[PDB]
Symmetry: D5
Subunit: 197 residues, 10 copies
């Protein structure tokens, strides 16, 4: 409804200053050519649902990297606020040490380009975007503020998009690794339909 | 973020002819005031990922209804094509008897209003939308065509939005019924962060 | 009133996936250079007048091919729906095996280019168009939905256009093969007028 | 599909001077409210196909008026040229006495309103339009200049439109008086399909 | 007030099919380079004032041609109607054989370019235009429909424009061949003024 | 066809200072309601063709007044130049005593409204206009500068328009008082055509 | 307020037919490069204040030519009216023989370019313009119609503009030849101020 | 002819702070209704020609006031600079005590509205304007910067406009009190032209 | 000079969530009617020059309040970041307890409305604004990022505007409470000038 | 809000005639490349606060030049008014001899380019601008008219910008020469924050 994020088309490019391993570092979408990217927005640092989502993704950052997928968090907060929040204990609502980059959308350009900017508050909705190695947007997930996303589901989607990528098949509803896929043509799809019904 | 579909705003209204218990009947968004709605688009009838999603939501339809949530499917196909597909055995790629309405979007107005129309093919992306009893859009999920959605995650989101709606709290990442929520203010949020860290 | 189908001018180009001999194949207008084309639209698959028209043209398919004319049916339905309709017995309202291509116009591009789209329903009127071997539109026939067309008249028109094309004469009202044509000049036409009055 | 001539919409209004029983008289579409109207354009008086179409319709004008349908011929020629042609014997290419009005479209307004004007020559194509008693356009037929229309098919279409009007059924391909029509709903339509297949 | 005919400027070019010696022929202004042209429009064939004007100019055609001036008649009627009028005896209101071309302005292009089209009826006023051998418009005469023109005055005007072209003098009111002219300068003009007063 | 001068429409209104009987007087078109008006423009005072036209109309003004027709001359010159020209003897190129008003079009409004202004020189062409007692323009005559007009033809045109006005018939070519007119309908017109051919 | 005459900028170029020594001659601004020009407009020939200004400037023409300044008169009247006015004795309100050119602005271009055209009357106000040898407008003087201009003041200005051009000093109020000028700088100007106060 | 300054039309309204008898006071055009006004612009305070003009008008102020005419000076300088200049002795290039107001056009609105703003420098040319008691502009005078104006000519012009105002006559070239005026009609003007030639 | 911030006009209205005494509280410009306001922006929380300015104004807060002036700080950081920064000890670069509100401009509306937004980084320049008790903007101070502002000068300016407000006088350069002011009129201003020179 | 002065961007270029050492000289921004520039506008010469700000900056001119900073004063008054004011003793409200250039902005270009023009009065606000040696605008100070600026704060700001320029650090609030600056990164800024707290 706003922005430029479109399924099947190149994901909107982004460049931003990020906090990587307690240090400031520039991050841009071009750095991930050939790797999947899970870009997820959150409204504000030092809030409530946001830390649980950042922590949950950081704890499982390696589960995505094993698959060749890098996870990126972003809010409109500056990299100094990110660093401060990272230097705050998790028991106090902080992030503690983080295994994923944390971008600073101080210009709001990323949130606007991805159409997740809640304009009346100038903060980003809980928008999650899955981008493939070729820089093409594959998936969009946006939540209202009071409800957090699921890292399990985001991982399942990355897996499904990679498995259908290389084997040229399509994944049924609820597909998880190890489950059958469908050969997307009239004749060969009968194998799946006759087996599972 | 989808055509006229904006989170926090009234969901785009819709009226369409649908197949309900094997017969044609009108379906309007106004029919579901006071109830949650999961509206999910799929590209084409008589294809491959689509019947598995439609069948999944139909099997789980009562799980949503016991929560006061009505599930609706929709594609650009006519109700006559829907009925023919319903009358095709699932063993042959059909749908069999269904427990959810199947809306016909032959004017492509629903797909266009919810910004899920793949313009170069004229079919809707795998867009899913969660609307609350007040008619407000709460969640947007759009997958590329090769990968199906998750009914389990859709149910979790409906559950989290209903719970946070009732108790004025917010659900952390991966929240499920029984898990703790967070009191969204600086002071009371410490109860959760200290308990879980 | 809408579209680009003008008599005497090149027929609007079209390109679409079609069901040919139970398989999906691409169909272009350019594929018929040098041959006549009867392109007839119909509103919806699995309806009532449409099967009788499609079946009637399929039975007479060779009556047009003997004359170097190819018949093509089209509707906004997909090739997967077309194929399902073909695989439905005629006694049950289906098409059965078909002797003509059945194009899918899911993007509504063909219907809009040929100005037959019923906007308020998103379906094509019963528009029929006759195109000569040079890609020029010779005839337009659009019926409202309740009334089916006449395969006999379509054959008569193709015959008349081919005859007048070759001999440079003009066919009178109700002309059929074996009937007198008129030499379109003041002097030579007197032959016809004196004879038939 | 013809200028302002759109199926299912009110036919473009017209008012023109016409030759009626050898005298000049004003004719307007509103004069035929409650009756069907067959309005056929032809390019030029004192030509070749045109007299055969006018004569054929004239000879069968009473077959249409027995159905409550009025036949009207139109061309850009003036009422004086019309009358001169009526006063020319048919053996010499004239029309002789006529049993249908012959409107004069000297301003080209009717031809432009019905989208049949061949602009590079200033003459009307061979457009035929069927209008019901409510003034709604039901059928469009347009031939290139060298081929004449069929009065039989025009009468069949009038009959079909009046029959489907009265009984709420739909007429299949090639339907003629006395043949079966289809009940346009899924269940009741099976009667026809099993009987005729 | 309308059109492009302007005195002292190149006369609007024209090209039309005409009846010449009982046959059809293309006529265009460029055909008359180096010759004077009298182009007279008339509203409708088979009317009342028009045949007398056409007949008059036809009878006087050689008076004009002896001065190197060609006379052309034109109306919006087609060449077929022109010929049928020519084949009507003058006793019955026809033209009989003609010695001037009769142009068919069926596209109304000529009438519009010369600003004589009576828009509310689609017919040309009684506009007469004199053009010199260089294509430059010299005279405009336009009569309302009920009053015919004067061939004597048309001849007189052609004679005047030709005499003044050759001798660089100007012709006073009512000048005819043999009358005195005025040398157009203050000193030499006194010769005429002192003699004629 | 001249600026706002359209045949059959109300003649462009005008208001100008004029020399009448050697004195200045305002003249306006409404002054001549119920009377015919011959309004003739001429380029310049103290030139060559112009005095011969003005003098000719002056010498014959009473011939027009006997018919209820008032003649009016006009040029872009001022009333003071007009008066000086009237006070110049005709032997010296002057006008001498005049019997018609001589209007001053110093603002060029009349020439512009009547479409006769030679823009590159700012002077009026030899435009003559006939207006009936109802203010409707009936005749346009415009000569190039070097050729003067004919008072004989102007009078004949006034006689013809008043006769056709009064008796509802049309005057044929070269019609003069005493000659036959044509009753403008198909049947009654045969009287004239058979009598005169 | 209107036109292009801007002091300090190149004077508007003009090109007009004029009366020079009883004969017609083209006159352009370029003809006067290297000389001063006093261009004075007046409303109408054969009026009242105008002859006194044209005569006054004529009788004083040699005083301007001795300075290298040419005096030009112009009105919207034609050259034929000018000459008639020149050929009118001064006792009868004429100009008699003139020693200055009298330009004809029949197209009103000169009056429009110099912004002195009294639009509602089509005549020029009493505008006077002083141009220098380089074609630069130096002075504008426009009187309402009932008040004549002053040749003395026009001469004083030409003298002042030539002296200040020559000596690079500025002339005080009322300066005439022989009076002191001011050195336009702070220090040297004190010479004048101390001496004249 | 200056910005909004049109002779014969209401002079552009103006209001501005002025120095009056050594104090600051608002001065607006409406203050002088019923009195003549000479409004003269000058470029810059503390310059060279400007003081001599201001002083010249100041000394002659009562000569204008005895005629019912008020004199106003204006520049883009502020009133404080005006006062400082007034407090500067004349021997030092100052104005000394002043008998006329000195307006401050700091916004340049007066200079722009009267079309005298030398834009490249931001100062007013030496524009003088005479306005009558009706608020109508009667005279425009604009000198280039090096040459000062004549207070004598300004007084003569005021005298001439007031005289022609009261007596309905017109003043010839160089008129001064005592000289003859002209009765502006053809007949009565003869008295003057005969007496003076 | 700042977006909508204009000296002498109503200051841009604002409304924002702010941290006050360690808690969140809405703050709007209307709350400070009758009181002066010092609104100072700073780029980012947890940076370097900002805390020194914020601390300096907080330490002097009562000096401003004793004068009836309220000091407000604002950055584009959220109120949660502000609080966290306030809860960081000053020795750690935090703010520690504050005695002034800390507004959050996360929508950037305040920074945009006051024209201090560094667009390329999305942060506010070191802009300080002084608003009087009537809501009018009186002073603008904007510093480049690397140079902090002066609380002494800000206080001096508030005192100067309050003093000049109540006595209708003007404060010289460097004025401080106790020093002399100037009566802003020519005569009375001499008291100050002679005394201090 | 108006103009083109933006912090951190090249200062708007300017060129003007100025009074330097009692003489006129052209001044432009390029003359000060590599030097800091303090450009301060003031509304009007011969007023009250303005002379005290000009004298204050003049007496302190060398204090700025010792730092390589040049001070420029500018108002809309002309250089002639500047010089008259300089030649007025300070005791009488004048400036006396000056040690800084005084620019003349008679075209208001500078004031408009720097967005300090009080448009309703045509005078500049008390806008002070600090431009560095590279021509980049570093600081904006705009005071309402009745309150004078502080030279001490201007000097302080120039010192801070020059120190931060050279040492790549940032100066805290109230910094003056000899005080500590801050190393602008998270790790090194702790040196300042722990020492001073």
């Amino acid at each position: 409804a706003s922005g430029n994020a479109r399924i099947g088309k190149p994901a909107p490019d982004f460049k931003a200053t990020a906090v990587v391993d307690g240090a400031f570092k520039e991050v841009k979408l071009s750095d991930y050519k050939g790797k999947y990217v899970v870009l997820f927005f959150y409204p504000l640092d030092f809030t409530f649902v946001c830390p649980t989502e950042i922590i949950a993704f950081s704890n499982r950052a390696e589960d995505f990297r094993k698959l060749g997928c890098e996870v990126l968090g972003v809010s409109v907060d500056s990299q100094f606020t990110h660093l401060a929040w990272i230097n705050t204990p998790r028991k106090e609502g902080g992030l503690g040490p983080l295994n994923i980059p944390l971008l600073a959308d101080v210009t709001r350009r990323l949130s606007e380009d991805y159409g997740v900017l809640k304009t009346d508050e100038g903060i980003a909705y809980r928008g999650l975007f899955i981008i493939d190695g070729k820089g093409v947007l594959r998936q969009i997930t946006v939540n209202d503020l009071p409800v957090g996303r699921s890292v399990d589901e985001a991982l399942r989607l990355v897996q499904a998009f990679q498995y259908t990528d290389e084997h040229g098949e399509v994944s049924p509803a609820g597909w998880k690794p190890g489950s059958d896929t469908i050969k997307p043509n009239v004749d060969d799809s009968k194998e799946y339909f006759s087996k599972h019904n």
